[PDB]
Design a protein around this ligand. Sequence first.
Ligand SMILES: Nc1ncnc2c1ncn2[C@@H]1O[C@H](COP(=O)(O)OP(=O)(O)OP(=O)(O)O)[C@@H](O)[C@H]1O
Ligand SMILES: [Mg+2]
Ligand SMILES: [Zn+2]
Lengths: 202, 649
Amino acid sequence: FSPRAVYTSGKASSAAGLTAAVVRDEESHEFVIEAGALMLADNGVCCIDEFDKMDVRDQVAIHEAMEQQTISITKAGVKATLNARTSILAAANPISGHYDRSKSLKQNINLSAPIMSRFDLFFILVDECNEVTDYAIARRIVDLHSRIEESIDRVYSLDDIRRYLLFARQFKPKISKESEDFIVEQYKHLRQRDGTKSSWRI
Amino acid sequence: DLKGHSVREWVSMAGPRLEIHHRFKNFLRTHVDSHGHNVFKERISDMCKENRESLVVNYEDLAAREHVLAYFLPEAPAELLQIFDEAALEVVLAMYPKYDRITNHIHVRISHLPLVEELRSLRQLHLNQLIRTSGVVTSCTGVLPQLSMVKYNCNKCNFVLGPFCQSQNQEVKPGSCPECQSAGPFEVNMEETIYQNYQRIRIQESPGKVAAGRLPRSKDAILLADLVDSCKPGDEIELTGIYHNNYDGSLNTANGFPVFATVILANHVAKKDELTDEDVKMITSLSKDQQIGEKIFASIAPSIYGHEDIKRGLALALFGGEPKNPGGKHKVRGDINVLLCGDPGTAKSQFLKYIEKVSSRAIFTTGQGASAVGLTAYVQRHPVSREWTLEAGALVLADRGVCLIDEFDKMNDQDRTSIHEAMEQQSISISKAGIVTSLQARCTVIAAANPIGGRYDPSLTFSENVDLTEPIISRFDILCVVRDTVDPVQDEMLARFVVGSHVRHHPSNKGVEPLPQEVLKKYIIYAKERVHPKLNQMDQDKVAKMYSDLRKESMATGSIPITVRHIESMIRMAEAHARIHLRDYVIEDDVNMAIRVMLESFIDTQKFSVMRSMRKTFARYLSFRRDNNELLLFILKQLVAEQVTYQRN
DNA sequence: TTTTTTTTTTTTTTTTTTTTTTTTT
DNA sequence: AAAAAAAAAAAAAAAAAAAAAAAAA
Ligand SMILES: Nc1ncnc2c1ncn2[C@@H]1O[C@H](COP(=O)(O)OP(=O)(O)OP(=O)(O)O)[C@@H](O)[C@H]1O
Ligand SMILES: [Mg+2]
Ligand SMILES: [Zn+2]
């Protein structure tokens, strides 16, 4: 859906191809920069499937990108500080292949603490073996596979949503005093939540 | 004077050439100011006085007084600028006839050019024109000596040949020597030749200016004989220069298209961004405030709320102690290393970054490899310079400054060994390729770390809930245990702080008084460089009794004991606190404050039960300069928290 | 005959992959 | 005892600096 959206895998991407690389221009004395997956997601999204499987040598780069939004390269006779303003949608399998509900999120996955720290949202999708949910899922899947082109009545076409997203991204909302007080109270309550235990501290 | 067929050819003619020459001379003489009568008078005076051999000329005034010359300028920069140099030389001689002995030449630099472009907007249309751009210097070579006025030496008849002025476009080829009429090889004659400094830099688009789906572009520039060393890598610079193209650049080589490389002949450089006098009065003026200690302790990382004790420790680390080596066989470091161990989300990295920002010769590195410079030394060919250099470890780079180490508990084995060596012996020993050397790194290490398991548990002593061996922790003078404990009042206050910061830094809108940061660093410089307190007034009786009591108490329980190095650290912190006040003699209150800080750290390093044991046993020491309100508020908060826990269980 | 552009060669370094080794359950 | 992560080996590719030879006029 999203333009400037780049999808990758766990171990299928190396460091250079995932962040950046440098080659020398074949026609002059200057050097050109091969843009890695992170860069192509600039002002977009990077979808890292099987994140937990990614090598540490690459996870350090992803952590750097999340930290300062930028990639610093000193290679092949050229230095550069390039911009990577990308959001990261990661998909990580729980350690052991199944999510264990009797542990904190820190233990259920093999992500380093710095990586998890700067993830704004963690969504846990446990496969509760409920019959109603299974019936609904089966109905939807079979309806999809029976009626391929139809059966999808989306109120807004993907092109319309793309245009609306591109227009709305330009807005820079303010924070009024009332909203500031509401944020303060909500944060107070959310911290009080952590006073049973939660999947991870707040 | 719009007339003719070609602008460059128009200036080429002798007539308009001399017309422009004399008009520019008259402009230099006559253009005075709105009120600064004859700015160029004092300009030339100062330049000659310091022997600067340069003249920065604003474009606005030149266009105002002589619009024709300003219009001609960008179209054919080479000829107009050469004429301006010729004019300014004789103008200077008229003002300073003797100065003719100095450089026999004057360069004219032009600034505030009206139209400013970006490296991505450069096109063939801009060839051979004065253009103003902005960018980050991404690489810069040494000050290479380039031939200026060569005198080749004929081999056959050993006759030196006349000066063949070197051109930036083509290499000079000598003819046949006038004497023996030989077209032989010839060789430079360095003793009789004269050169000019030649630096080559690369300027790339500022990342903050690049668009979303685009990559920064870069252009090569040449600085010549006076702009050299005016830039360093990482500088944001406005560069005005000639988009020169015709030197040798044409891909006539096979498997190549008729492309042309481009380099900007630099003509003016402006960096967009501390040895003063009479500021000693300023520093001394508030030095006698009698409460400056609180001011400075509150003037550290003003963007961080609370954590006052950590700020005090960082202030003491900044001002440092007094290194002393009795005889030459007992090396005692004057530094105050600090370790901030705490659960995440408590602004430890913020403190480290503030110290990076506020302290000169301060470098930042991380336990991970995400830092520009590593902790360990090595030797290699630098990737950008391609030159074989000894990359000294980060600690060495901060030889007399501050090394900030984030993720202190995620280092490598070799990184741990290197930090141990630096902290222990204050030097690094390298034997990597053939360099058997020992270079000293007298750095103050300020480290940040998280407890094992991501949460600090007071039921366990400090040394066991941190992924650091005892020898490493034993070399830190202050241990700050930052704990994130749920507290509604503090939570609300911090929420207000950060949300207000977010409000105030929106793009559209872009109990003492803390000192301004610039004055704070001036004070730090003066204190750290001039005042060297001596502890001739320390009460040995009090310190000895305190140490003996602490030994007895710590050994009375199964707790980490107090050792001599703790007394050493207390001495260093007392000297640092005296340095803050520039007393030049440690006073009883300085010693008491140092004892307070050292005991606070040592107590907080203990387990939960021993924490209260030593708090009650030494509450007198730990309460120095701690007014009644603070203790009463702490006790009330403890009681109300106990009530809350009883309520919600 | 004399220049010039290429040809090599001779070092050195750098990067990817694979393999080998070390640490943990 | 066996798997996961790290380190080292090793082989292939690139830069490049300089000396010598073949082709051109
Ligand atoms: N006392 C504080 N005052 C102001 N801002 C704070 C404070 N504590 C935390 N913050 C803010 O909360 C965020 C978290 O802080 P920060 O990113 O520096 O974490 P940290 O202590 O370095 O954690 P970690 O150990 O995970 O690296 C930042 O945006 C920081 O500005
Ligand atoms: Mg941190
Ligand atoms: Zn001769």
